[PDB]
């Protein structure tokens, strides 16, 4: 489950649910009520990974980041995931930032220095390339993904429930 | 816009 | 490998081959001579997962369903390729899901149908039997040739053979 | 860990780093200083898998090959030296030249050939029998050749390869 | 002509050539041997504008930036050529680069050194263009690495514009 | 900076800010708190130019009209970006014309609309209110988000404040 | 307005209209009844600029040419040409009665045939040869089609009115 | 004019306006305030046709459906729909307030979401699912973009006046 | 065949041929020797429809206009050919032009005189098509200038249709 | 419904079904069991129209021909879809013209062929038998499958029986 890397060892809240097959490596911080599902890998060796509270990383997904060059003309984001975020099955989340309540559709890929605003839906099977800034409260999908439109209030209320229901799921385990 | 695929 | 969820334990046929690293959770049923390959996840906690006879779920794939809108029902002699995501859909007998594909909720794949590698089948999409279907979002390409239907009648049967050479 | 298939046991160099959750099955050969990361599956039952020196197979990836027929020729999976196969890739019965980079989430199908010093973009699909030249950028689904690589990108593939080796040493 | 904005006065090297019709406003710094051609506008009021050594801003072009409260100032390297009627907006341009006439470079874009942007190109926000390439189109795409003759042309283009400006006043 | 053409003198509100290098010719009406930035050209000789209140015409832009048959009518709190060509068109309140864009005769830009930089809006094109429109030739992409609407509400009002910091 | 460059002073016909904010530099020759509109720059330092009779160079445009080498074409514009607002005209040849749509860019050694229309916002790349009597637009610009007889007639009636428009900028009796 | 087919007589609301030259056959239901304009043909012999309230079927249009296979969509049109002139509406489902551009062709088992516009001259192929609140056009038709709230407001305020247009007959 | 809308009745020249199945509603004016073929619908309720002399509106076509609140009525010149199953909607069409069968012309569009629109074409709102051109596609594009013989073919296309309708001596 | 043109009267088989609102003018021959649906117009004044046996001309369609060239010849068991324009062409037995299509003069459609909905077959285009052809301008896409050919053997015949349940 946990593995140290250099001097780093994962800082995982007591209420975080961690399923079987998961591997969390190195500089990884995970907050309260977050749930990490089967065979997910969170490899915080190149750069850190921070995951807020109430966030779900679903099965077979991978979180990582590109190698840091310690140059100043090269912005190089770590992996920062907010609260009540849903990261779908088999996603690849790579050195990007994801705002609160957002939903990354299963099988999507998010590359380094991209930013997903809060309350945003990434369609399944999408690809968000490096340095793409996705605003809050939109639907964004495709390969490479396009901003389609602002979300409806019904879709926003859905985001308000998605990650909380996954928390409820993890407690019955 | 987006269109371009800079890098990777 | 096997995990209970609430009052549900997997009902796995004794001739079912289950590779190492697999996790089968909750309301899952798997039929005779089906084979579940390395690191696949079959998570039946939101809905039931039903898998017929002689079907292969290949490595690193994920089977799930959405909140209680369909469960996951897979027929007999189905091949689900590596790293596929099979999510709340229905797949008919003898069909082949190309590796790395994504099939979303309430989709239905007809029997004897080939889904190309790396396809996305969107929610509620109905794919007819005996067609080639590919792309993201997937679209029906053409009818299957009889030489391709012949292949479909072997694919899952050869994978039954292959599973037997393991600890099985 | 490692699993026997018929008469075949994996041949793995003693400096190969094999992370936890990995399954390596059957006719698999892995060379010096290579790194197989967490939950990767290397299934050499249908055909063989040969991985050179200093190569990285990243997390949740799958290596396999299609069933060989008695025909039409089936390619095994052959991966050169100092190659990087990205997270959650599917590498299926193809050949990959030295120093190349397979962007995370890509799918490379049977009899395809990736030239050396080439970059496959993340999320690409390289279809059956497609032949990608060396020293190019290739991406998309289906993938197409975009352009030649710059000297900086080529130097990146060189300098990157070694860095992936030091990373495993700290484990 | 030079204009003050709040507390900011342009800081212009004593060897900088500034052509007639030019307006330079506020927080703008221009290095030695640079040449600013007819009717160009360098408005450093929302954010600062920095231009290095031996750089030419050609005729009728506009340099500006977006309001700040992350947002990038305008930073132009040494021996850079900004072609006629270009719009240079809150971006970074590395040494010896050539911005094709009529191009538009938006905020937080970065142009690597020794690169050519083709005429009439559009480089949108947050795009990173590597060094030593040809990049063109609207929106622009990276086309290829530059040949050695093109890198040589870059070594000389800005320097020729220096000598050119010396023949004026 | 102000020029006569035949019977027509520019009617420019007293609070309008006019930078150096500007030339305003003929039948041009500019409302209160508008600001016209360096080296812009407003040539009302083939036809009239009417500009509402709080509107900014940015540097090195040009306003004109084709030989007479719509004139150039720009609403309130409009932003016309640097080096634009605005030609015999109508632009509604609060809209933003991205720098380097070209708007041709009888085109109409709805209110609260964003035209992306470097766009070309051809003759007789009607662009709806509250959309993002861009490209050459331009396409309507989508409706603007609330955050983009809020940005437009503040865009020209901040430009008015920008101009007060200058010497009039 | 006029500027010397080395031993070149502009040669401007005495009926040429040159609006305020214009800068004409060096080796520039401008023919009878031509009109140079507000804030245009005609920089004849790298190479010569020659403009014929009754041609209009509209507001905020730039005419220039590339540095000559060891073969560079100067800027040559024929009679009754309309160069639209904010164009960049760079080391190219433009034939009689042609219309260069506003915001276009014409690069070195390009050639626009006479009686030809270049659509607004177009980019005509280096060495491109655009035939006479065609409609051509886009970026990079492609020949769309031949002009109709009506469109050719409109070109013959264009620049003419664009000269008269400028005549209204001076005089006391008429 | 109405026609029996087998044991189906059209069920037409008493406030429905039916213009001259119209033929309505068999299993067709038409709701209150709907208008069927000149020379339109609504043939419900292969399968049913159901039209909601305040819906307009414009002139020279045809509504039909394919031979049903009992081993299959009828034609279902919601409320306040506008079916443009000379359209072919074939075994599809059209949601409330949508507008089918004149001369369009919608084939079997297609579904048009509510508050959607199909551009004139479009072809929506078999089993095509068009989401609500979009602009869709072409042959084959493709989703172009979402509609604005104001454009949706126009749809809501439209077919109302189209009902009133028939009251003057 | 003729229908009153509000306080308009059609103004139809006494030599106009009107085939069976036609419906002419409201504010419609049709000139001398024009011929309106079977099952055509000319609905002048939203706005006016004006049709010149010697013009043919062929079978199963529809003429209408969008709601008025500029906003163009439908105006067709002399010796125009509107092909079978066309949709002519709030546009202007100049003399001697030919609209290929199954074409669609949308509101505020304008077709120059002596112009050919190819069959199955779509001319969108506010598009201005010049005289003397061939224009086709969906959406249509101007292709080229018409040739001498194409012009000559236009000069006789509507006249032949007049003569054809006069052979309907039962019907006129 | 039937109209004389000059010396010509339509010749219509006594088992031909002719719906209300149809107009058949002049030199038109229509064979046995054919069915002409509501508001179709068959105008045989410029040139002749000949329709074989068991053929269906669907609602709101138009059949015509150019001034004299090619007459309009339609074989047996053909399906002409709703709102089609069939103009001076020849269509072979068992073929299906998808609804909203336009077939221009001297075009030839081989037998057992499908024209996709909304297609434009240009003047003089020769479409071979047993293919799917579609688009605007239409192009031969591929040969028909067995199910598609089986489908063509049934389409017109079903439309025959459809028309017999009418009054
Ligand atoms: Mg929205
Ligand atoms: Mg919105
Ligand atoms: Mg919205
Ligand atoms: Na926080
Ligand atoms: Na495949
Ligand atoms: Na499909
Ligand atoms: Na250039
Ligand atoms: Na643009
Ligand atoms: Na003059
Ligand atoms: Na020069
Ligand atoms: Na431009
Ligand atoms: Na002129
Ligand atoms: Na209904
Ligand atoms: Na049509
Ligand atoms: Na018979
Ligand atoms: Na079809
Ligand atoms: Zn990584
Ligand atoms: Zn963007
Ligand atoms: Zn799930
Ligand atoms: Zn495999
Ligand atoms: Zn994928
Ligand atoms: Zn600015
Ligand atoms: Zn102008
Ligand atoms: Zn254009
Ligand atoms: Zn220059
Ligand atoms: Zn039908
Ligand atoms: Zn209408
Ligand atoms: Zn005809």
Residue numbers in the entry:
A (entry chain I): 1 to 173
B (entry chain L): 1 to 8
C (entry chain G), F (entry chain A): 1 to 68, 76 to 175
D (entry chain H): 1 to 71, 74 to 173
E (entry chain F): 1 to 69, 75 to 174
G (entry chain D): 1 to 70, 75 to 178
H (entry chain C): 1 to 71, 76 to 173
I (entry chain B): 1 to 69, 75 to 177
Text from the published report:
The 16S microbial community profiling of a metagenomics library from geothermal spring at Lisvori (Lesvos island, Greece) enabled the identification of a putative sequence exhibiting 95% identity to the γ‐type carbonic anhydrase (γ‐CA) from Caloramator australicus (γ‐CaCA). The sequence of γ‐CaCA was amplified by PCR, cloned, and expressed in E. coli. X‐ray crystallographic analysis of the γ‐CaCAmut structure at 2.1 Å resolution, provided detailed structural insights into how the mutations impact the overall enzyme structure, function, and thermostability. These findings provide valuable structural and functional insights into γ‐CAs and demonstrate a strategy for converting an inactive enzyme into a catalytically active form through rational design.
Structure‐based rational design enabled the design and creation of a mutant enzyme (γ‐CaCAmut) which possessed a heptapeptide insertion at the active‐site loop and two‐point mutations. Kinetic analysis demonstrated that γ‐CaCAmut was successfully converted into a catalytically active esterase indicating successful activity gain through structure‐guided engineering. The thermostability of γ‐CaCAmut was significantly increased, aligning with the thermostability typically observed in hyperthermostable enzymes.
